Amino acid sequence: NPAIKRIGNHITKSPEDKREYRGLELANGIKVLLISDPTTDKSSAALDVHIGSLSDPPNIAGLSHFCQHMLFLGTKKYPKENEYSQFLSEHAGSSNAFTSGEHTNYYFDVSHEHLEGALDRFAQFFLCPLFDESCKDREVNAVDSEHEKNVMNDAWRLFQLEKATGNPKHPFSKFGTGNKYTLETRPNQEGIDVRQELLKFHSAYYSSNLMAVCVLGRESLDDLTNLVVKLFSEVENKNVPLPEFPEHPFQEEHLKQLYKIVPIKDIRNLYVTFPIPDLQKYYKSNPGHYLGHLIGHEGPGSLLSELKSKGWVNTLVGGQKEGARGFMFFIINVDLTEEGLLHVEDIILHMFQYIQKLRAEGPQEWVFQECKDLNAVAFRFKDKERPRGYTSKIAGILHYYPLEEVLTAEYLLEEFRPDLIEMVLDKLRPENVRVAIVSKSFEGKTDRTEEWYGTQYKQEAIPDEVIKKWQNADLNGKFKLPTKNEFIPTNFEILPLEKEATPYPALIKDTAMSKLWFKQDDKFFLPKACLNFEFFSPFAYVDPLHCNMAYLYLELLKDSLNEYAYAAELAGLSYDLQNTIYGMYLSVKGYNDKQPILLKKIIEKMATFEIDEKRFEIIKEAYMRSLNNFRAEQPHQHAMYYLRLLMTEVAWTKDELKEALDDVTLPRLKAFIPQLLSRLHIEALLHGNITKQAALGIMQMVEDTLIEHAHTKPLLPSQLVRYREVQLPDRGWFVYQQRNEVHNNCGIEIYYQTDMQSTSENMFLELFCQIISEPCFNTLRTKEQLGYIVFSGPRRANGIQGLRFIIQSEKPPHYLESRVEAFLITMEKSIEDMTEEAFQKHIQALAIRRLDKPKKLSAECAKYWGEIISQQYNFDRDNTEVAYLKTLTKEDIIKFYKEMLAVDAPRRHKVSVHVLAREMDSCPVLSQAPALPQPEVIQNMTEFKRGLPLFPLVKPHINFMA
């Protein structure tokens, strides 16, 4: 009563959302949204502090981010550096946090039965962080590593280069991540006791008046209230003024500027920016979004359309970009074709012509009304959120909207504002534009360097002569506003539940041409459906060349429908179409009303496709760069890539692919498509607000369309070939080594292949993985600090599984190899030493993780899809496997380890991929690392697979139907 300052009134929610809500402000001024969901299997809490990088003291960059890391390492109440993390994993929970320029958001989830234990521990982060001295030195490393991975990343480099091109005095120029230099090195060589700096900052800013909390669980709103009051009213209120940044970081001297940047990958991009006022307050009208919607439009008449037709650009992004309380930006970025790179001037001219067209037409309330009506539908039928994301999201926005509005606030438009719309529009002018071109062509031509990432760039002033030509931009007949979106749904009737309906997808069609799986939605009751289609054809992956074609074909098809599908896009109807090693994949997700129309359009197009000369050349050129650009991917990604190539029966490599690419000609492609489409087998899963007859017809309509235009006939059954995984030999150990020429770190994946998937083998691996999950992180990272990326878990492919570790670090692979091997022995002991309850706790957490039920249609659909793709069709796996899981004993897991994992194990199957750093030319191969044998260094992948047997495929769980 006196701990609570205010109780908001009914929190406006959708009539579909059955969760209970209560808004409220505490005495200390913390804003809170309580969420009651009696059915959730996992509860959640999140706290957003409205302070971040921008408030980073000038002499210690990234203190806010560092502080973020440190709170997870111990409090007075719970001293153990890993007490928080360990408590979550043991109770099926997870957690994380992030830091932005004005916020620090911490969140977690845990089994619904441990919200308190969880939340209690969590609250200490904001009451008594210990900021231990030993944890501080260790963790400064993790941060450094995090920043390390970002250095060779084009996105991060441009993100910071912007901050560096504006007013240096503005806190916007700050380096938010920090690293070893700014967080330890420099501080030292300047006499700074960081543990104090952390303590300082935390006390100065973690004031209750600047915090929002969101908690969700099965407890009653009343119970949730007491709970939050109990653990949070004790957070002190130092009435700290919320940082404001009136006055744009981009001032006059920063306008009419041109920057030429050299990228890491081979990409071509034009970045156009305009400084705009902070539009956040205008959330009920959203003038910036109106302009974003139009300028960003991709349908007929749109700017993107003309820019694409002149073959200058391929994609476009327009709209308002966020800055901070006090300033925002309005951007328009397009990628560039080769020709496009030479018409940047003209491209920007068109941009100003389209904008001029907007001025000429003036606000358009029907467009507002359309966006408004759409958004209304969106909110009503919004899918239920996974609790963690939801709590995290509400927590952050509680800082911007009235308790009552925190839900509807970002979805419901309320007021039409011609005035605002015209105000922002008036800022999209040549006199205050910023232009940035990103091209390798600038290699050598630059004369400046961004200090933090090392970005190569030159700066010029845009010639008043040119600025002038842009102001004179007059209307262009190629530009027309969009017309009424005929794709907007209107039918939301949720069909009654057919009596013969079932709990799992049913096989309702089994023919040479197609195997149709179907399930009518029996739990989410939203006017949506998922139409998933698997197209099988040997000619999609038959050889490198055909792979490039299957890809280019589908990519050109998507390009043609783009302009037509953009509408369906904005209307909650979208499709995913891509080539696979088995042929093709198509998925249509969204409101069911208009799906059949889009589907039919998609299939009809792919069966009667006519390739454009110019589009083919442009797309191909990009595909080339795309394959090449893999060399700029992170080490650990390279590691996973290679291990995938090595363990799979068939697998063309990016080198092979780009080699075969030149041989792909327009004629050649035109011939490929019909051959691809001539013989197929389709396996589909239709799931949602749809009936069995509706579904059978969709399946028949697809089949029929193909038959009529591609004369497609059935694939033979024996032709339905699946690839196998290479069978490693008992007690073997191979090492395949490569070098990452861009990044300056090492990567590594170690895979201990066990056996074919199966109820028993599966759980043995899953329980063991559950048990070592946090310990691994805690050991290889928290303690040993090997690097930012440290992962462990099961590996599942081609029906086979195993335990694997992935690490990206500065230390050499062979070194990581040792520490891991060591960690393995540490776990063996740990397992012998843990109490029986400890063990049972782990079983329970695994169980809860597996039995967690999907909250939305796409989620449930996906689990099914997987059983189908894997041809295992084990739709009841979770109940079965958990049942079995509960039967395991500390003894079983020890046996499984001794037999499959232990360094001296009889059936240890070990493969390693070492990806060396840029600087290391070559290289070899506290805890006690078991003495390792002599690995057999893989010289050639083809040879490697030839000399080993291949496993069999898993036997399909016969789903007797008709």
From Swiss-Prot:
Effect on the protein of changing R724A: Decreases dimerization. No effect on degradation of ANP. Retains the ability to degrade an aberrant form of ANP, when in the presence of both ANP and the aberrant ANP
Effect recorded for Y453A: Strongly reduced enzyme activity
Effect of substituting S89C: Increases catalytic rate towards INS and amyloid
Active site: Q68 (proton acceptor)
Result of altering E774C: Increases catalytic rate towards INS and amyloid
Binding site for substrate: H293, L294, I295, G296, H297, E298, G299, L316, V317, G318, G319, Q320
Cofactor(s) named in the record: Zn(2+)
GO cellular component, one term: peroxisome
Regulation: Activated by small peptides. Activated by ATP and GTP, and to a lesser extent by CTP, TTP and PPPi. Inhibited by bacitracin. In vitro modification of Cys residues impairs enzyme activity.
Binding sites annotated in the UniProt record for Zn(2+): H65, H69, E146
Its biological purpose: Plays a role in the cellular breakdown of insulin, APP peptides, IAPP peptides, natriuretic peptides, glucagon, bradykinin, kallidin, and other peptides, and thereby plays a role in intercellular peptide signaling. Substrate binding induces important conformation changes, making it possible to bind and degrade larger substrates, such as insulin. Contributes to the regulation of peptide hormone signaling cascades and regulation of blood glucose homeostasis via its role in the degradation of insulin, glucagon and IAPP.
Entry text on domains: The SlyX motif may be involved in the non-conventional secretion of the protein.
Protein's UniProt name: Insulin-degrading enzyme
